Amino acid sequence: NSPRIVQSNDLTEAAYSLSRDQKRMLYLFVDQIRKSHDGICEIHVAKYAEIFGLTSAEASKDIRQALKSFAGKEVVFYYESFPWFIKPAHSPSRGLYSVHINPYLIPFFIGRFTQFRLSETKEITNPYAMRLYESLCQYRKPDGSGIVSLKIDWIIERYQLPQSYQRMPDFRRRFLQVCVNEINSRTPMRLSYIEKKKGRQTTHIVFSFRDI
DNA sequence: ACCTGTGACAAATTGCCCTCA
DNA sequence: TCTGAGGGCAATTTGTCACAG
DNA sequence: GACGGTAATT
DNA sequence: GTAATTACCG
Ligand SMILES: [Mg+2]
Structure with missing residues (x-):
């Protein structure tokens, strides 16, 4: 082990x-x-x-x-x-x-x-996905599940995402979907999410996960 | 004005290969 | 011979932005 | 290179 | 020959 x-x-x-x-x-x-x-x-x-x-x-x-x-x-x-x-x-x-x-x-x-x-x-390749998996582990329960809401701006300023990911569709396509897919394909975690919005802007992402 | 997705291109990273002290 | 320090690669992913809705 | 099994020195 | 102890190759 x-x-x-x-x-x-x-x-x-x-x-x-x-x-x-x-x-x-x-x-x-x-x-x-x-x-x-x-x-x-x-x-x-x-x-x-x-x-x-x-x-x-x-x-x-x-x-x-x-x-x-x-x-x-x-x-x-x-x-x-x-x-x-x-x-x-x-x-x-x-x-x-x-x-x-x-x-x-x-x-x-x-x-x-x-x-x-x-x-x-x-086995994770993308470093931002390692960052995300660490931040999810921070909230994990003994049994292996958890749920947490992360602010988009705080994600960008903590993981130091590049500037074009301040445009939300690129954020979705090149960071969020890829790192969730990596986590789901390369770790013993099973991860889902939903977007929280305020007006037209999406402000937080809510992650739920369990263990296989 | 704002928001979303997609299509293109460039720049960077990957697991490869080979060579020699 | 087995290590590892270099030199390269094509295929793939990542970063960026124009454009239509 | 570095090492280690092998032959070759004395 | 054995047994201690050094140079070379893969
Ligand atoms: Mg490598």
């Missing part, structure tokens, strides 16, 4: 923009940190490859490009911004990377919490 990720709701609801590969590495960082500290973490190529069913080559490529793409990225807890890394990554040994996560982020990871096993998300 796969590693059980837990995280403060403050991270689930933080504002940031990360890719799938970056979020994948971040889950392992959160696991290492939580089992305790100083903030220095490590990643092995071959273990990453085995965890996510990748080749060693493509694992290496994903880690390397994720790592150089962290530079300049920031995290916002609502309203305080932090950088993820305070030193570049570096490799002491072949197939091994050592990273220095901002230790000031530690209390935000481990505190009103969200939890899910890593097997639930490791």
